[PDB]
Amino acid sequence: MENFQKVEKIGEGTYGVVYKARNKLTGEVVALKKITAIREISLLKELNHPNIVKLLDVIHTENKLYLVFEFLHQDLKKFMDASALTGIPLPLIKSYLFQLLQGLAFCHSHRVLHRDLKPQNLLINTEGAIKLADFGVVTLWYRAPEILLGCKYYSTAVDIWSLGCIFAEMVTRRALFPGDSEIDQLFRIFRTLGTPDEVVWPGVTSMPDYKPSFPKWARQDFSKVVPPLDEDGRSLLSQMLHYDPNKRISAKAALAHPFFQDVTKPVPHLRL
Ligand SMILES: COc1ccc(CNc2nc(N(CCO)CCO)nc3c2ncn3C(C)C)cc1
């Protein structure tokens, strides 16, 4: 800590308080998060990708672990709130979706999962880049149904489900499944995608928190769920939201989806 001057608190991430800070020697401006774990965290220092927020240093000292990250100037939640009157332009949505899928394809190839993707953890800069941060009231809005049903050994698919939920929210300007308890989160999912059964998700009825007494709701039409997203966007979103984690599209396969045939990298309008 003595090598860093706090400039301001910018957040309380899940694992602790985050400060913007300046390195007293390097002059570098960084984000400092103050929080088996040593060895895992050290392995993250190697997982470098242009769409992953760089972890610069891990400082263990005195019952405190500090993590020093590259600093970005805005998060997607704030940008979404800033762009709510007009909406984020489709080409920028597609570019951010495509970049995030590149980040996930990289992490998943190294068998690292995020598990807690949410707009506040997706960070943007003036050049049109978006990056995944801060790998794992707690928000449930992005949690995959297998996690909600008590699967202990869930997979990379959970991150595809969270990113699908964020893709829908960029497009409609409303959270897709804004649950305020675990059951309300699961029932919001069922009310929109249909209560899952053995046909669409083999094994579902033997999940730890599955109850036969769950209400059975009909699936709704996607054209009702994300207007005015085009047929290619809806097709991709449907594959990122399949109930069975084994049928859910991978990040690698999503990158090849026809929705990205015309992807580009627009500059966002950022007011810092
Ligand atoms: C004037 O206040 C602000 C507020 C937010 C930002 C946006 N930059 C960053 N925001 C956040 N978080 C706050 C989310 O709003 C925590 C994410 O878990 N973590 C970062 C940032 N840059 C690097 N890191 C690492 C710790 C990952 C800038 C300035």
Domain endpoint, select from 70, 93, 123: 70
Dihedral sign computed on CA atoms, order 123, 10, 120, 49: positive
- Integer Cα distance of 93 and 228 in angstroms: 13
Atom of ligand 1 nearest to the CA of 20: 29
Q: Are 25 and 138 in the same domain?
A: no
Q: Are 215 and 245 in the same domain?
A: yes
96 is in an annotated binding site: no
Report if residue 37 sits inside a domain: yes
Report if residue 151 sits inside a domain: yes
Q: Are 109 and 12 in the same domain?
A: no
Q: Give the experimental resolution in Å.
A: 1.8
Cα end-to-end span (Å), the chain: 27
CA of 29 to the centre of ligand 1 (A): 12
Q: Which residues contact 153 (CB under 8 A, 6 or more apart)?
A: none
H helices of the chain, where? 37-44, 76-82, 90-109, 145-148, 157-172, 182-193, 222-225, 231-240, 251-255
Q: Is 237 in the pocket of ligand 1 (CB under 6 A)?
A: no
Report if residue 270 sits inside a domain: no
**Count of structural domains, the chain:** 2
Distant-in-sequence contacts of 230-236, Cβ < 8 A, 24+ apart: 232/257, 232/258, 232/259, 232/261, 233/94, 233/167, 233/171, 233/259, 235/259, 236/167
- Integer Cα distance of 128 and 39 in angstroms: 33
How far, rounded to the nearest angstrom, does the alpha carbon of residue 113 sit from its chain's CA centroid?
Answer: 11
Question: Mutate which of 19, 123, 132 to test ligand 1's pocket (most atoms within 8 Å of Cβ)?
Answer: 123
Number of H helices and E strands in the chain, helices first, is 9, 8
Q: Are 49 and 175 in the same domain?
A: no
- CATH number at 29 reads 3.30.200.20
- Integer Cα distance of 157 and 246 in angstroms: 8
Q: Is 44 in the pocket of ligand 1 (CB under 6 A)?
A: no
Residue 120, domain extent: 74-260
Two structure tokens written together for 69: 């990250």
Q: Are 131 and 247 in the same domain?
A: yes
46 is in an annotated binding site: no
Q: Are 239 and 210 in the same domain?
A: yes
Choosing from 57, 81, 116, 221, the catalytic residue is 116
Give all strands of the β-sheet with 130-132 in edge-to-edge order.
Answer: 74-75, 122-124, 130-132
Q: Are 80 and 42 in contact (CB under 8 A)?
A: no
